[PDB]
Amino acid sequence: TIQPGTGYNNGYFYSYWNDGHGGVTYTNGPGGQFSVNWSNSGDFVGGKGWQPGTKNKVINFSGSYNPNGNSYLSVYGWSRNPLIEYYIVENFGTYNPSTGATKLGEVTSDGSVYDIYRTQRVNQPSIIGTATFYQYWSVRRNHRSSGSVNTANHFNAWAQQGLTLGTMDYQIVAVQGYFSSGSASITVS
């Protein structure tokens, strides 16, 4: 669609990355809109939001999300110091990203209970280069493709459980895929 990279579009930060396998297109639309179309893709992530994010943002999203295979729809971002990759997963495809992960609690927010987990990435790519870092997850039990996410409820619950976030880096609503197919059209605000 557009070239993989980051930048700004109609007031919103955007990030689109892929592994070069092919099979995925990403486009930026008016306002906070973005679309992703994929067919037998590789690894990729794309979406719109903010740089930097905040710890008390109420993120609104709306649209369609039709994965065929392994993909997630999430409020997604990172913190620095400590380096953390985090997800508030609103929907997913064939794989629940918390499969086999250590459960760290539950939090109720925006119409559903979410299960909290912590995982670790070892010597993997990150916003600061190859590194070992933790990932925090809130996985929504009631899947959806529109709604509002009160990020503070998640960040506070994570903190209560000992999952600390550093200074915020980017924070976006993202469609992530791993060797799958699908389509999505989401508007963020």
Short mmCIF file of all heavy atoms in Angstrom, two decimals, residues 72 92 94-104 115-120 135 137 139:
data_model
loop_
_atom_site.label_atom_id
_atom_site.label_comp_id
_atom_site.label_asym_id
_atom_site.label_seq_id
_atom_site.Cartn_x
_atom_site.Cartn_y
_atom_site.Cartn_z
N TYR A 72 -3.74 -10.53 15.34
CA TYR A 72 -4.29 -9.88 16.53
C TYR A 72 -4.75 -8.47 16.18
O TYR A 72 -4.22 -7.85 15.24
CB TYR A 72 -3.25 -9.68 17.65
CG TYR A 72 -2.26 -10.79 17.91
CD1 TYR A 72 -0.92 -10.49 18.15
CD2 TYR A 72 -2.65 -12.13 17.95
CE1 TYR A 72 0.00 -11.49 18.42
CE2 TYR A 72 -1.73 -13.13 18.21
CZ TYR A 72 -0.41 -12.81 18.44
OH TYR A 72 0.49 -13.82 18.71
N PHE A 92 -8.62 -11.59 18.03
CA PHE A 92 -7.55 -12.34 17.41
C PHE A 92 -8.13 -13.43 16.51
O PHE A 92 -9.34 -13.67 16.50
CB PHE A 92 -6.53 -12.90 18.42
CG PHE A 92 -7.13 -13.75 19.50
CD1 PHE A 92 -7.47 -15.07 19.26
CD2 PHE A 92 -7.33 -13.24 20.78
CE1 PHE A 92 -8.00 -15.87 20.27
CE2 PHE A 92 -7.86 -14.03 21.79
CZ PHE A 92 -8.20 -15.35 21.53
N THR A 94 -6.70 -17.33 14.79
CA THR A 94 -6.57 -18.72 15.21
C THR A 94 -5.72 -18.96 16.45
O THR A 94 -5.77 -20.06 17.02
CB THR A 94 -6.00 -19.57 14.05
OG1 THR A 94 -4.80 -18.97 13.56
CG2 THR A 94 -7.00 -19.68 12.92
N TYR A 95 -4.96 -17.96 16.86
CA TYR A 95 -4.09 -18.12 18.01
C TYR A 95 -4.27 -17.07 19.08
O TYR A 95 -4.16 -15.86 18.82
CB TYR A 95 -2.63 -18.07 17.53
CG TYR A 95 -1.59 -18.27 18.61
CD1 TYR A 95 -1.54 -19.45 19.34
CD2 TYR A 95 -0.64 -17.29 18.89
CE1 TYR A 95 -0.58 -19.65 20.31
CE2 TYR A 95 0.32 -17.48 19.86
CZ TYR A 95 0.34 -18.67 20.57
OH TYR A 95 1.30 -18.87 21.54
N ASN A 96 -4.49 -17.54 20.28
CA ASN A 96 -4.65 -16.66 21.45
C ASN A 96 -3.20 -16.43 21.89
O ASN A 96 -2.51 -17.39 22.25
CB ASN A 96 -5.53 -17.31 22.56
CG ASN A 96 -5.60 -16.47 23.84
OD1 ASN A 96 -4.69 -15.67 24.10
ND2 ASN A 96 -6.64 -16.67 24.66
N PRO A 97 -2.71 -15.19 21.84
CA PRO A 97 -1.29 -14.94 22.14
C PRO A 97 -0.85 -15.29 23.56
O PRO A 97 0.35 -15.32 23.83
CB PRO A 97 -1.11 -13.44 21.86
CG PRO A 97 -2.48 -12.87 22.03
CD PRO A 97 -3.42 -13.93 21.53
N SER A 98 -1.80 -15.54 24.45
CA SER A 98 -1.48 -15.90 25.82
C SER A 98 -1.37 -17.41 26.02
O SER A 98 -1.18 -17.86 27.16
CB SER A 98 -2.53 -15.35 26.78
OG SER A 98 -3.77 -16.03 26.64
N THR A 99 -1.50 -18.19 24.95
CA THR A 99 -1.42 -19.64 25.06
C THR A 99 -0.11 -20.06 25.73
O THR A 99 0.96 -19.72 25.25
CB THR A 99 -1.54 -20.29 23.68
OG1 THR A 99 -2.80 -19.92 23.10
CG2 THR A 99 -1.46 -21.80 23.79
N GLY A 100 -0.23 -20.76 26.85
CA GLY A 100 0.91 -21.25 27.60
C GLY A 100 1.61 -20.21 28.47
O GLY A 100 2.60 -20.53 29.13
N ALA A 101 1.11 -18.98 28.47
CA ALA A 101 1.73 -17.92 29.25
C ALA A 101 1.26 -17.92 30.69
O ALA A 101 0.16 -18.37 31.00
CB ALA A 101 1.43 -16.57 28.61
N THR A 102 2.10 -17.38 31.56
CA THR A 102 1.78 -17.26 32.97
C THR A 102 0.72 -16.19 33.18
O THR A 102 0.91 -15.04 32.78
CB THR A 102 3.04 -16.86 33.76
OG1 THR A 102 4.07 -17.81 33.51
CG2 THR A 102 2.74 -16.80 35.24
N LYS A 103 -0.39 -16.57 33.80
CA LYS A 103 -1.47 -15.63 34.09
C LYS A 103 -1.07 -14.83 35.34
O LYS A 103 -0.78 -15.41 36.40
CB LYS A 103 -2.80 -16.35 34.26
CG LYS A 103 -3.97 -15.42 34.53
CD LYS A 103 -5.28 -16.18 34.49
CE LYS A 103 -6.45 -15.29 34.91
NZ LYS A 103 -7.75 -16.03 34.91
N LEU A 104 -1.23 -13.51 35.23
CA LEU A 104 -0.87 -12.55 36.28
C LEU A 104 -2.08 -11.85 36.92
O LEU A 104 -1.90 -10.87 37.64
CB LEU A 104 0.12 -11.51 35.74
CG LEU A 104 1.60 -11.76 36.05
CD1 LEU A 104 1.92 -11.46 37.51
CD2 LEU A 104 1.99 -13.18 35.67
N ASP A 115 -7.90 -11.18 30.83
CA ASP A 115 -6.92 -11.98 31.55
C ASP A 115 -5.56 -11.34 31.28
O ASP A 115 -5.27 -10.94 30.14
CB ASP A 115 -6.99 -13.43 31.10
CG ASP A 115 -8.31 -14.07 31.47
OD1 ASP A 115 -8.52 -14.28 32.69
OD2 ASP A 115 -9.13 -14.32 30.57
N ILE A 116 -4.76 -11.23 32.33
CA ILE A 116 -3.45 -10.58 32.28
C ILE A 116 -2.34 -11.63 32.27
O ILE A 116 -2.41 -12.61 33.03
CB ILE A 116 -3.26 -9.67 33.51
CG1 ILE A 116 -4.38 -8.62 33.57
CG2 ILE A 116 -1.88 -9.04 33.53
CD1 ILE A 116 -4.45 -7.86 34.89
N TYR A 117 -1.33 -11.41 31.43
CA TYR A 117 -0.21 -12.34 31.33
C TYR A 117 1.09 -11.59 31.12
O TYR A 117 1.12 -10.43 30.68
CB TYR A 117 -0.37 -13.30 30.14
CG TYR A 117 -1.70 -13.98 30.04
CD1 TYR A 117 -2.79 -13.34 29.48
CD2 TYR A 117 -1.87 -15.29 30.51
CE1 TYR A 117 -4.02 -13.96 29.38
CE2 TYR A 117 -3.10 -15.92 30.41
CZ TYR A 117 -4.17 -15.26 29.84
OH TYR A 117 -5.40 -15.87 29.73
N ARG A 118 2.18 -12.29 31.42
CA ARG A 118 3.52 -11.79 31.17
C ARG A 118 4.29 -12.87 30.43
O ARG A 118 4.21 -14.05 30.79
CB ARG A 118 4.26 -11.43 32.47
CG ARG A 118 5.68 -10.91 32.24
CD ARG A 118 6.48 -10.80 33.54
NE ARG A 118 6.43 -12.04 34.30
CZ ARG A 118 6.22 -12.11 35.61
NH1 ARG A 118 6.08 -11.00 36.32
NH2 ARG A 118 6.17 -13.28 36.21
N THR A 119 4.98 -12.47 29.37
CA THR A 119 5.85 -13.36 28.61
C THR A 119 7.22 -12.67 28.46
O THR A 119 7.40 -11.49 28.81
CB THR A 119 5.28 -13.70 27.23
OG1 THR A 119 5.01 -12.49 26.52
CG2 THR A 119 4.00 -14.50 27.35
N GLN A 120 8.18 -13.41 27.94
CA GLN A 120 9.50 -12.85 27.74
C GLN A 120 10.02 -13.17 26.34
O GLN A 120 9.85 -14.28 25.84
CB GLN A 120 10.49 -13.41 28.77
CG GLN A 120 11.89 -12.82 28.63
CD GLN A 120 12.84 -13.29 29.71
OE1 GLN A 120 13.36 -12.49 30.49
NE2 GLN A 120 13.09 -14.60 29.76
N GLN A 135 6.97 -8.86 27.85
CA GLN A 135 5.77 -8.42 27.18
C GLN A 135 4.64 -8.54 28.19
O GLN A 135 4.57 -9.54 28.93
CB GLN A 135 5.40 -9.29 25.98
CG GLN A 135 6.49 -9.44 24.93
CD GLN A 135 6.10 -10.46 23.88
OE1 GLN A 135 5.92 -11.65 24.17
NE2 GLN A 135 5.95 -10.00 22.64
N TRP A 137 0.40 -8.45 28.66
CA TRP A 137 -0.81 -8.68 27.92
C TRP A 137 -2.08 -8.60 28.75
O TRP A 137 -2.12 -9.12 29.86
CB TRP A 137 -0.84 -10.13 27.37
CG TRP A 137 0.34 -10.56 26.58
CD1 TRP A 137 1.53 -11.01 27.07
CD2 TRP A 137 0.45 -10.61 25.15
NE1 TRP A 137 2.38 -11.33 26.04
CE2 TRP A 137 1.74 -11.09 24.85
CE3 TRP A 137 -0.41 -10.28 24.10
CZ2 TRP A 137 2.19 -11.24 23.54
CZ3 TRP A 137 0.03 -10.45 22.80
CH2 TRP A 137 1.31 -10.92 22.53
N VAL A 139 -5.82 -9.75 27.66
CA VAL A 139 -6.54 -10.38 26.55
C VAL A 139 -8.03 -10.35 26.84
O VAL A 139 -8.50 -10.95 27.82
CB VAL A 139 -6.04 -11.82 26.32
CG1 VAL A 139 -6.77 -12.44 25.14
CG2 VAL A 139 -4.53 -11.83 26.08
#
